[PDB]
């Protein structure tokens, strides 16, 4: 019923499957409000696609269907969910992992919607008021497609007093313990934005232990809950974790504890990564593997970090405490920060330092985090293993 018209010469990407309706690409007189279903049409009134309104950035909403006759109802989501579920048969068949993503937004057909499986406890995240409107229809479909002990939610958009919490089912006591790569972690689906682990780094964590941990001093910067450290510690001589947040210490200790690792056999520091570079370098400390996985942006009073602008500083600091033979695991999650450009920054920085280097591995989102083949920013994870000689 409601219509948005494409600007001339902007049709083609949309005809070819581009899922994000860009504000700059369309105009409408139909008063598009969050929640609204609308059709995109060319200047010559050809139907292009059906989308829903959910603004983020320069974005109006997301394409949902190319079938004019398809109504956006429970049966609609039931179909996407079954397809999403079927594409994850591997995660149901593997030992050692009971937590993974079931539905990854636009990669699975609905931008702004994610569903995670934390050992039977589902976490649904909504990235706009727009997609929230469909909560009832979506929940009915969840009930029709998925098995679960409970359902939690989080609202991942501004100006909502309600933040999320328990939805239905049998509520557990948090933290609950999940398993991934035969490694145990605490999770809390009801406390602040983050759950205690980032599932998208499942395979990166595996590789770190498998290939870059044995008998090494492993440094983990911006450690959060110490997940990288926890898994690497079964192989490393010892790990060192560094995070600015007070909580990180006890949370990290506890994760070590779940895996039969004495926290006292590991090093855990609460401080700014950049301060740690100094302290480590002043005490002549060296590490064989340095994991760097910072937030895209962070602020500490006056002090700010931007992944875009400050990554060279991260690399130079690590190098000054990396062993002659050593590996850097350089990661980001910033969708705005494309792999090409990330690799460029890494290369430039390393070339400037005069060290010998080799990008040995480049990893992206795992399969449970299905990306969209016509939307490049969906591929937001970059993890680059770099072997160093200096
Ligand atoms: N300047 C800084 N120095 C060290 N840690 C920082 C920091 N600024 C933010 N952090 C921490 O970085 C974390 C962002 S989350 C990082 C997740 C982590 N890489 C993992 O593998 O799970 C937060 O815990 C935050 O406390």
Under a CB-based contact definition with an 8 Å cutoff, are residues 98 and 147 in contact?
no
CB 38 within 8 A of CB 54: no
Distance CA 5, CA 39 (A): 8
d(CA 375, CA 390): 39
Cα 292 to chain centroid distance, Å, stands at 15
What whole-number distance in Å separates Cα of residue 214 and Cα of residue 195? 29
What is the distance between the alpha carbons of residues 4 and 41, in angstroms, rounded to a whole number?
6
DSSP annotation string for 272-341: -HHHHHHHHHHTT--EEEEEE---SEEEETTEEEEHHHHHHHHHHHHHTTEEEEEEEEEEE--TTS-HHH
The ligand 1 atom at the shortest distance from the C-alpha of residue 205 is 21
Neighbour tally for 351: CB within 10 Å: 10
Q: Rounded to an integer, what distance in angstroms lies between the CA atom of residue 373 and that of residue 18?
A: 9
Residue 113, beta-bridge partner list: 126
d(CA 294, CA 291): 10
Q: Which residue has the tokens 């792999």?
A: 339
Q: Ligand 1 pocket: which of 196, 224, 230, 274 to mutate (most atoms <8 Å of CB)?
A: 224
Whether omega for the bond prior to residue 217 falls within 30 degrees of 0, making it cis, is no
Place of tokens 């760097």: 292
Distance CA 379, CA 78 (A): 25
Rounded CA Rg of the chain: 22
**Inter-residue contact 177 to 121 (CB < 8 Å):** no
3-state helix, strand, coil in the chain (%, to 5): 30, 35, 35
The angle formed by the CA atoms of residues 104, 109 and 113, to the nearest 5 degrees, is 45
Q: In a 10 Å sphere around its CB, with 0-12 CB exposed, 13-18 middle and 19+ buried, how is residue 60 labelled?
A: buried
Give yes or no on whether 1-69 and 175-390 have one common fold: no
Nominal resolution (angstroms)? 2.1
Give residues with Cβ within 8 angstroms of 136, minimum separation 6: none
* Best CATH choice for the domain 175-390 from the list 1.10.3210.10, 3.40.50.1100, 3.30.1010.10, 3.40.50.150: 3.40.50.150
**Residues lining ligand 1, judged by CB closer than 6 Å?**
198, 201, 222-225, 227-228, 242-245, 248, 272-273, 293, 295, 298, 300, 305
Distance 272 CA to ligand 1 centre (A): 9
**Does residue 104 sit in helix, strand or coil?**
strand
CATH level 2 (architecture), domain 1-69: Roll (2.30)
Residues 6+ apart with CB under 8 A from 86: none
Is-contact 25 8, C-beta < 8 A? no
Ordered by start, the domain boundaries in the chain are 1-69, 70-174, 175-390
Q: Whose CA is nearest to atom 2 of ligand 1?
A: 272
Give 117's strand partners. 100, 122
The per-residue DSSP string of 333-368 comes to: --TTS-HHHHHHHHHHHHHHHT-EEEEEEEE---TT
CATH annotation of 70-174: 3.30.750.80
For a mutational test of ligand 1's pocket, the pick from 195, 222, 331, i.e. the residue with the most ligand atoms closer than 8 A to its C-beta, is 222
26 phi, psi to nearest 5 deg: -130, 160
- What tokens appear for 9 in the block? 């010469």
CB-based contacts of 242-248 (< 8 A; 24+ apart in sequence): 242/269, 242/271, 242/273, 242/276, 243/269, 243/270, 244/270, 244/271, 244/272, 244/273, 244/298, 244/300, 245/270, 246/270, 248/223, 248/224
Distance in Å, CA 244 to ligand 1 centroid: 7
Distance CA 185, CA 201 (A): 13
User: For residues 321 and 280, what is the distance between their CA atoms, to the nearest angstrom?
Assistant: 7
Paired tokens of 313: 């500083």
Pocket test for ligand 1, best of 250, 295, 313 (most atoms within 8 A of CB): 295
Q: Are 141 and 74 in contact (CB under 8 A)?
A: yes
Give the HSE-up count for residue 67: Cα atoms under 13 Å, Cβ half-sphere: 5
CB half-sphere exposure, 254, CA atoms < 13 A: 14
Q: Measured in angstroms, how far is the CA atom of residue 289 from the centroid of ligand 1?
A: 18
Partners of residue 171 on adjacent β-strands: none
Whose Cα sits closest to atom 17 in ligand 1?
224
Beta carbons of 248 and 226 less than 8 angstroms apart: yes
Nearest CA to 163 out of 209, 194, 205, 184 is that of 194
**How far is it, in rounded angstroms, from Cα 56 to Cα 22?**
10
- On whether the CB atoms of residues 205 and 235 are closer than 8 A, the answer is no
The token duo for 143 is 């009930």
Task: For residue 381, give both structure tokens.
Answer: 């994870």
Q: CB-hemisphere CA count at 13 Å for 19?
A: 20
């Amino acid at each position: 019923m409601k219509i948005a018209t494409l600007n001339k010469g902007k049709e083609t990407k949309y005809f070819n499957g581009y899922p994000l309706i860009e504000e700059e690409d369309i105009y409408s007189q139909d008063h598009l409000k969050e929640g609204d279903i609308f059709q995109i049409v060319t200047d010559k009134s050809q139907y292009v696609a059906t989308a829903y309104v959910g603004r983020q950035h320069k974005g109006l909403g997301w394409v949902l269907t190319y079938d004019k006759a398809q109504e956006i109802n429970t049966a609609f989501f039931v179909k996407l969910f079954n397809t999403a579920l079927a594409e994850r048969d591997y995660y149901f068949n593997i030992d050692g992992t009971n937590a993974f993503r079931l539905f990854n937004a636009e990669g699975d057909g609905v931008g702004g919607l994610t569903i995670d499986n934390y050992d039977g406890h589902l976490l649904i995240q909504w990235y706009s008021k727009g997609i929230y409107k469909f909560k009832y229809a979506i929940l009915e479909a969840v009930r029709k497609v998925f098995d679960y002990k409970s359902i939690y939610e989080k609202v991942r958009f501004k100006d909502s007093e309600y933040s999320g919490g328990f939805v239905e089912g049998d509520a557990p006591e948090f933290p609950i313990v999940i398993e991934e790569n035969f490694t145990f972690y605490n999770v809390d689906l009801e406390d602040g934005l983050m759950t205690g682990i980032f599932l998208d780094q499942k395979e990166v964590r595996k590789k770190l232990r498998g290939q870059y941990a044995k008998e090494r001093h492993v440094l983990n910067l911006f450690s959060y809950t110490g997940a990288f450290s926890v898994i690497a510690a079964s192989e490393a001589s010892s790990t060192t974790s560094v995070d600015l947040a007070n909580r990180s210490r006890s949370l990290t200790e506890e994760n070590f504890g779940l895996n039969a690792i004495d926290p006292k056999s590991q090093y855990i520091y609460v401080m700014d990564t950049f301060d740690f570079y100094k302290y480590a370098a002043r005490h002549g400390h060296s590490y064989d593997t340095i994991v760097i996985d910072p937030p895209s942006f962070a602020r500490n009073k006056k002090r700010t970090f931007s992944v875009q602008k400050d990554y060279d500083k991260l690399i130079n600091g690590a190098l000054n405490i990396l062993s002659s033979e050593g590996t850097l695991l350089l990661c980001t999650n910033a969708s705005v920060y494309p792999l090409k450009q990330f690799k460029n920054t890494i290369k430039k920085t390393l070339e400037e330092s005069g060290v010998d280097y080799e990008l040995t591995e480049v990893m992206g989102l795992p399969k449970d985090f299905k990306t969209h083949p016509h939307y490049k920013p969906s591929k937001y994870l970059k993890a680059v293993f770099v072997n160093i000689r200096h």
